[PDB]
Amino acid sequence: GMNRGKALQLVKPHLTEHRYQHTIGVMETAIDLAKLYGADQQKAELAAIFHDYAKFRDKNEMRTLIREKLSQQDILFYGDELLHAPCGAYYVREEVGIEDEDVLQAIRFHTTGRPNMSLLEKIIFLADYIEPNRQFPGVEKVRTQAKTDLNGAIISSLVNTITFLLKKNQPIYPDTLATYNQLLLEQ
Amino acid sequence: GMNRGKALQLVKPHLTEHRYQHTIGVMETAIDLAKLYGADQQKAELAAIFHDYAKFRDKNEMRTLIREKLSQQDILFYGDELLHAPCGAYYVREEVGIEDEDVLQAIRFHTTGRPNMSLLEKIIFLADYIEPNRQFPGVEKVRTQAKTDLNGAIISSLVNTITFLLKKNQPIYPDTLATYNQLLLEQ
Numbered sequence: 001g002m003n004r005g006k007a008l009q010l011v012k013p014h015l016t017e018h019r020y021q022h023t024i025g026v027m028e029t030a031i032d033l034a035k036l037y038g039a040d041q042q043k044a045e046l047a048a049i050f051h052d053y054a055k056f057r058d059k060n061e062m063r064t065l066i067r068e069k070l071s072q073q074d075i076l077f078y079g080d081e082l083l084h085a086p087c088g089a090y091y092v093r094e095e096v097g098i099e100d101e102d103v104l105q106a107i108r109f110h111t112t113g114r115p116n117m118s119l120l121e122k123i124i125f126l127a128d129y130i131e132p133n134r135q136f137p138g139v140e141k142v143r144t145q146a147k148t149d150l151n152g153a154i155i156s157s158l159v160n161t162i163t164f165l166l167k168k169n170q171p172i173y174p175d176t177l178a179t180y181n182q183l184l185l186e187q
Numbered sequence: 188g189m190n191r192g193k194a195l196q197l198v199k200p201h202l203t204e205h206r207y208q209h210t211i212g213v214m215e216t217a218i219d220l221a222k223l224y225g226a227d228q229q230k231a232e233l234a235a236i237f238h239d240y241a242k243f244r245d246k247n248e249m250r251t252l253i254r255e256k257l258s259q260q261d262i263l264f265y266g267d268e269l270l271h272a273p274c275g276a277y278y279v280r281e282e283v284g285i286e287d288e289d290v291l292q293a294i295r296f297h298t299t300g301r302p303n304m305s306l307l308e309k310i311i312f313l314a315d316y317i318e319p320n321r322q323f324p325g326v327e328k329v330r331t332q333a334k335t336d337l338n339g340a341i342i343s344s345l346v347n348t349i350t351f352l353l354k355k356n357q358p359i360y361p362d363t364l365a366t367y368n369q370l371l372l373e374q
């Protein structure tokens with residue numbers, strides 16, 4: 001890892017003020033969930049600070065990176081918002097020197113999720129959704145649910161996200177539904 | 188193929204009045220969609236009459252048939268409603284002697300859909316959803332859409348289906364989402 005203040009200082013120039021504020025919220029929320037569920041709070045903190053590092057990077061450069069250097073090529077068919085998580089994990093490793101594989105994995109899957117996520121991945125996934133600045137409808141219920149049921153809170157978040165994409169007639173990454181089904185079948 | 192009268196004589200004994208009205212509704216809607224989109228109206232009629240042949244068959248026998256005789260085993264993880272289409276396609280061939288592969292596929296995929304459905308599969312899938320006795324919320328828009336945009340009506344139906352399943356926290360068959368995505372991405 002690395003110093004919190006330096007980390008925040010490094011990410012901020014890559015974010016709008018609104019997104020920087022979001023990042024602080026995710027950080028605070030990730031730490032709290034890390035405490036509550038026995039996750040490493042420092043890895044949670046760091047993954048939270050850099051989760052949106054690539055949010056505003058050039059989309060053509062990011063699609064090229066996926067094609068030329070990264071693993072899951074199918075993401076290219078399912079929406080430009082799917083770029084930043086995987087590309088960010090790559091860029092933070094290459095541009096900042098974060099090599100903590102746990103931290104990078106949590107960044108990598110924070111947008112789509114994946115079946116059988118690690119605790120740290122789940123914490124960042126959910127923190128992103130329920131951080132205090134978010135105003136998606138029904139968030140309060142998910143926040144409350146998060147206090148006692150991490151997986152259930154994640155299921156609830158996925159329902160809201162997938163519902164929204166359907167209403168907007170946008171494509172839905174198949175591994176996001178696989179996450180919903182996996183967690184649901186886990187009960 | 189078998190004519191309407193004979194086909195109906197074979198399904199009627201296991202149809203309540205509501206189910207009989209469903210059959211006729213699907214049958215007439217399918218014919219109209221066939222007329223509209225240049226599909227075979229006799230195959231549309233026949234597939235419609237038999238689409239729900241296995242609806243009220245023994246669910247344990249059906250699960251066993253999926254296990255012993257059929258290809259897709261994963262269907263058994265996503266709800267009892269997914270049994271009757273593939274098993275019905277099987278039973279109609281074996282018991283009724285219908286070997287028309289176009290008719291049988293239309294029966295097989297009418298509940299879940301698949302990416303890259305034939306026109307006849309699309310007509311039966313959609314006819315089931317928009318037949319006049321169906322009262323699901325938003326149906327009227329879907330019926331209007333169907334008069335001009337078959338793929339769009341099917342997208343709208345999937346949106347309402349998947350949305351409902353998400354809201355009730357039910358497992359969603361992945362190939363149903365693949366269907367949505369395929370039709371969406373093609374337009």
Ligand SMILES: Nc1nc2c(ncn2[C@H]2C[C@H](O)[C@@H](COP(=O)(O)OP(=O)(O)O)O2)c(=O)[nH]1
Binds near residue numbers: 082128176
């Ligand atoms: N196509 C598709 N889009 C998705 C999926 N999951 C999330 N999204 C989209 C919906 C939102 O517009 C966007 C939000 O991105 P995020 O990484 O979760 O949050 P943020 O980066 O906006 O803070 O991601 C998904 O599974 N498929």
Ligand SMILES: [Fe+3]
Binds near residue numbers: 051084085110111
């Ligand atoms: Fe993000």
Ligand SMILES: [Fe+3]
Binds near residue numbers: 022026051052128
């Ligand atoms: Fe975020």
Ligand SMILES: [Fe+3]
Binds near residue numbers: 238
């Ligand atoms: Fe059916």
Ligand SMILES: [Fe+3]
Binds near residue numbers: 209213238239315
């Ligand atoms: Fe039916």
